[PDB]
């Protein structure tokens, strides 16, 4: 009984080891009060840009 139990358990353990459980997700977020992209202003003769 003891030997069967220990063997079966140790085989089950290495068999299930390929299961992948860590996963990535995508979150969408709208800005309400500002422009999302890097922002250009044109001065009289020149563009200048803010991150």
């Amino acid at each position: 009984y003891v030997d069967m139990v220990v063997n079966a358990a140790t085989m089950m353990d290495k068999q299930n080891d390929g299961i992948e459980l860590g996963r990535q997700k995508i979150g969408v977020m709208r800005l309400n009060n500002t422009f999302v992209g890097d922002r250009t202003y044109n001065l009289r003769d020149q563009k200048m840009v803010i991150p």
Binding site: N32, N33, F35, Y41, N42, L43, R44
Partner: protein
């Protein structure tokens, strides 16, 4: 006019604005007899953001 509009959840519109206006400099209009000149406006440049 050059413009870029944005909707804000408060029911407000935000615009990036470039405005240029005026009339062409004309030394050639040498005449005195036309004191009834077409009205001399200036020339003006503005760039800004407003909400």
């Amino acid at each position: 006019i050059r413009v870029l509009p944005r909707f804000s959840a408060d029911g407000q519109i935000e615009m990036s604005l470039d405005i240029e206006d005026g009339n062409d400099k004309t030394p050639q209009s040498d005449t005195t007899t036309s004191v009834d000149a077409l009205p001399e406006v200036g020339r003006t440049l503005i760039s800004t953001i407003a909400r």
